[PDB]
Write a protein that binds this DNA or RNA. Structure first.
Ligand SMILES: Nc1ccn([C@H]2C[C@H](O)[C@@H](COP(=O)(O)OP(=O)(O)OP(=O)(O)O)O2)c(=O)n1
Ligand SMILES: *CC[C@H](OP(*)(=O)O)[C@H](O)COP(=O)(O)O
Ligand SMILES: [Mg+2]
Ligand SMILES: [Mg+2]
Ligand SMILES: [Mg+2]
Ligand SMILES: [Mg+2]
Ligand SMILES: [Mg+2]
Ligand SMILES: [Mg+2]
Length: 321
DNA sequence: GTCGG
DNA sequence: GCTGATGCGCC
DNA sequence: CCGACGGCGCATCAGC
């Protein structure tokens, strides 16, 4: 809301750099800038003001001055007017089509949903499912539906083994009134950092009751697929579901990772590296002079990882952009 | 694109 | 098959 | 052409 013009402009630029330029570090720079501006508790009145925030430099300050003066950005007007850029940006919205595949498609004259549907022979299984549920996957999930989904997943997991614990993470755990998809963190006492089909049994039970409808990818620790709520005698949209099986003794690094947000995580890990540590979904470690990280540090809470880095604990609701 | 070694 | 790199993706 | 930028799972491909 506050500074929404500016954060929309920077997000649109980020998406162009990732999807069209294939410049992931410019995507991240624009996202980091939009994130810090979104948290700033004042209406920005100049680029000079904004330049004082970490991750805003000369170039973004100039773009903020243009936007504040005119209510638009000439660079974005030109991007929006380029059919090629617009086609490439559009195809990346398809699950399984990234910047490289999108550019290949558009170079071969595939520029629309109709072109993709006429050229399904050119798509892999992941892209075919992304195409089938394209409209469904653009939609967000109201928290009321996330609650029903939580209730099916937790009930079916308990039926496979009462010792599993399933935790719905991502935007849901941050308290969002709607979610892009469902993220489930799974633990079982039989899988720790010390000893080793725990994920498979859960996926199979959710397929058997027809909640999971399609598989995009599946290994020993990560499931990526599609699910659907049962409906009365209009169907619910198909939804994306992610399931991550994490070592039970690494639950807190796991839940911290899977709660996000994404920008919160990259910011928190970048701030660990400047403070001499490395954080992944499993552990927090101190860095050696040799480049090789040391032994996993003891962790009894999410707060304990904040502490090692000297951060005020943020409740999950305070980890959103 | 920005920051920092 | 491997390693290593890329492409898709997850926060 | 200053390099780093968060860290990693799964699927595939290149070059063995
Ligand atoms: N803040 C910066 C700017 C540049 N460089 C890189 C790119 C430069 O090409 C290189 C050093 O070469 P220069 O001749 O530009 O640096 P000098 O300090 O020698 O230049 P000057 O004569 O302006 O002092 O370091 C860097 O590491 N950090
Ligand atoms: C936003 C302006 C650009 O900053 P970055 O190094 O992406 C450049 O300064 C000018 O590039 P252009 O926007 O392509 O002209
Ligand atoms: Mg880049
Ligand atoms: Mg700054
Ligand atoms: Mg995509
Ligand atoms: Mg591209
Ligand atoms: Mg999510
Ligand atoms: Mg580890």
């Amino acid at each position: 809301t506050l500074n929404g013009g500016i954060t929309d402009m920077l997000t649109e630029l980020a998406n162009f750099e990732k999807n069209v330029s294939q410049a992931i570090h410019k995507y991240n720079a624009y996202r980091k800038a939009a994130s810090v501006i979104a948290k700033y508790p004042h209406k920005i009145k100049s680029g000079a003001e904004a330049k004082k925030l970490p991750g805003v430099g000369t170039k973004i300050a100039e773009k903020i001055d243009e936007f504040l003066a005119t209510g638009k950005l000439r660079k974005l007007e030109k991007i929006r007017q380029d059919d090629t850029s617009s086609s490439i940006n559009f195809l990346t919205r398809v699950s399984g089509i990234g910047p490289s595949a999108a550019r290949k498609f558009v170079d071969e004259g595939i520029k629309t949903l109709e072109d993709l549907r006429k050229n399904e022979d050119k798509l892999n299984h992941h892209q075919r499912i992304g195409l089938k549920y394209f409209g469904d996957f653009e939609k967000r999930i109201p928290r009321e539906e996330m609650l029903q989904m939580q209730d099916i997943v937790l009930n079916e997991v308990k039926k496979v083994d009462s010792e599993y614990i399933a935790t719905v993470c991502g935007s849901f755990r941050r308290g969002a009134e709607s979610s892009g998809d469902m993220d489930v963190l799974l633990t079982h006492p039989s899988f720790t950092s010390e000893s080793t089909k725990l994920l498979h049994q859960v996926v199979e039970q959710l397929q058997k009751v027809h909640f999971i409808t399609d598989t995009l990818s599946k290994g020993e620790t990560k499931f990526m697929g599609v699910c659907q709520l049962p409906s009365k005698n209009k169907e619910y949209p198909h939804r994306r579901i992610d399931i991550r099986l994490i070592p039970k003794d690494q639950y807190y690094c796991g839940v911290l990772y899977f709660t996000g947000s994404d920008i919160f995580n990259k910011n928190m890990r970048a701030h660990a590296l400047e403070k001499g540590f490395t954080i992944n979904e499993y552990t927090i470690r101190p860095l050696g002079v040799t480049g090789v990280a040391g032994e996993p540090l003891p962790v009894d809470s999410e707060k304990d990882i904040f502490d090692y880095i000297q951060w005020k604990y943020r409740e999950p609701k305070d980890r959103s952009e």
